[PDB]
Amino acid sequence: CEKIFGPTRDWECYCGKYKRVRFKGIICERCGVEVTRAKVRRERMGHIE
Amino acid sequence: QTPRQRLPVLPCHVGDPDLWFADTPAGLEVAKTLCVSCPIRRQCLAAALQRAEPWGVWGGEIFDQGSIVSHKRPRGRPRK
Amino acid sequence: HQCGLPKLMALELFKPFVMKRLVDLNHAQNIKSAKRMVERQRPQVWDVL
Amino acid sequence: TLLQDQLQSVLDTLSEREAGVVRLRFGLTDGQPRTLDEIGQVYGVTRERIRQIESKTMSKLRHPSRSQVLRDYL
Amino acid sequence: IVRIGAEVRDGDILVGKVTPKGETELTPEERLLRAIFGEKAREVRDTSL
DNA sequence: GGTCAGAAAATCGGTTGTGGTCAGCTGCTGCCACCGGTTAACCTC
DNA sequence: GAGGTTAACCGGTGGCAGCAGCTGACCACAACCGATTTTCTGACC
Ligand code: SF4
Ligand SMILES: [Zn+2]
Numbered sequence: 001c002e003k004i005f006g007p008t009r010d011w012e013c014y015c016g017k018y019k020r021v022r023f024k025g026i027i028c029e030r031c032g033v034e035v036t037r038a039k040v041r042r043e044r045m046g047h048i049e
Numbered sequence: 050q051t052p053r054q055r056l057p058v059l060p061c062h063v064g065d066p067d068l069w070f071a072d073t074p075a076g077l078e079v080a081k082t083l084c085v086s087c088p089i090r091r092q093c094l095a096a097a098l099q100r101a102e103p104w105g106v107w108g109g110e111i112f113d114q115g116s117i118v119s120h121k122r123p124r125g126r127p128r129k
Numbered sequence: 130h131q132c133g134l135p136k137l138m139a140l141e142l143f144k145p146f147v148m149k150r151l152v153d154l155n156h157a158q159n160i161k162s163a164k165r166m167v168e169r170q171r172p173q174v175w176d177v178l
Numbered sequence: 179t180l181l182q183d184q185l186q187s188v189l190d191t192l193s194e195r196e197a198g199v200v201r202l203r204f205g206l207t208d209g210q211p212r213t214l215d216e217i218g219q220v221y222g223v224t225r226e227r228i229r230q231i232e233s234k235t236m237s238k239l240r241h242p243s244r245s246q247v248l249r250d251y252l
Numbered sequence: 253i254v255r256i257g258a259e260v261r262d263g264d265i266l267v268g269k270v271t272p273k274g275e276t277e278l279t280p281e282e283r284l285l286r287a288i289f290g291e292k293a294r295e296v297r298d299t300s301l
Numbered sequence: 302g303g304t305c306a307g308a309a310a311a312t313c314g315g316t317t318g319t320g321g322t323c324a325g326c327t328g329c330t331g332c333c334a335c336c337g338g339t340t341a342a343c344c345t346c
Numbered sequence: 347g348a349g350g351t352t353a354a355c356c357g358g359t360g361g362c363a364g365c366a367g368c369t370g371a372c373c374a375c376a377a378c379c380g381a382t383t384t385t386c387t388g389a390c391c
Contacts, residue, residue: 022209051155066243125385
């Protein structure tokens with residue numbers, strides 16, 4: 001889930017609107033993800049309830 | 050010590066580039082004569098012809114907004 | 130204190146150093162040109178090396 | 179990275195009005211380009227004057243005297 | 253592919269093959285350089301033997 | 302044998318204008334994915 | 347001996363991409379004119 005474990009491309013939100021480095025740390029209400037690097041898939045934790 | 054290509058031989062980029070856009074017909078005459086020693090005046094002149102330059106010295110030749118000039122008239126009344 | 134070294138190995142070993150030096154001697158004006166010159170093994174690389 | 183630095187140097191070799199015109203035209207300062215009349219509005223002249231300045235500046239950049247350092251960056 | 257009898261050296265092309273890489277997004281700086289130089293978009297990627 | 306004055310450049314800058322072209326927007330056009338009802342196939346009350 | 351059952355097949359929905367027609371933003375260019383400003387020439391006599 002990209003909404004939990006970050007995006008899959010560098011500063012690429014999921015719908016595709018925000019694709020610029022001027023956007024940074026901005027969660028996108030349409031797709032759900034926060035714009036950042038794809039390196040955060042190395043160290044973003046999730047939990048099961 | 051360089052052993053590079055003919056870029057210092059290339060008299061386009063020897064000095065100041067703004068000289069090549071001189072706002073004085075005399076002031077660009079040195080620029081136009083400087084490409085008399087240019088190895089590549091044919092292809093450069095051809096490229097400037099086909100790309101429809103708006104300005105400047107090109108192939109050892111100035112260009113108007115559309116095409117080739119003999120040489121620009123200066124400010125004032127043209128003579129007889 | 131000395132040891133030998135074959136040139137086809139040492140050229141591969143010292144490749145970024147020789148890239149920097151033969152850019153600084155203007156034998157190749159950019160890094161990609163330096164890399165292609167090293168790959169084609171033009172004779173100036175030994176006197177640089 | 180060296181391309182970005184060389185681009186900054188050559189962009190700063192020309193004067194500030196056309197420099198900021200190119201920067202706003204291509205988003206080299208923010209990541210977002212502007213319309214021609216938007217740049218004309220934020221500078222102070224009409225968009226056609228802006229277009230003339232832009233075209234002649236693009237030709238000046240296209241000239242080999244400034245394209246020497248960017249001839250083979252592709 | 254090369255002709256029969258053509259003497260080769262290190263790293264030369266033996267088979268010329270180029271792959272359809274699709275189209276990716278463009279950096280504005282690459283856009284400016286492509287506008288300056290006037291070249292093909294080069295929508296395919298080379299993988300040559 | 303000086304002397305304003307006019308004509309005519311160019312040069313930066315508006316202007317108009319207009320024409321087109323394309324980004325996109327969006328209601329039809331039509332096809333495409335679940336959902337389940339039914340219809341001829343298996344085991345012997 | 348069809349009763350009851352059964353995998354698959356056979357109507358019947360909502361989703362989505364297309365998609366062609368319709369805006370308006372926005373540029374191309376094109377002239378085109380408009381102050382500016384030199385500056386040369388042109389009669390006065
Ligand atoms: S304008 Fe003339 S001198 Fe300058 S680079 Fe082109 S051909 Fe050479
Ligand atoms: Zn999104």
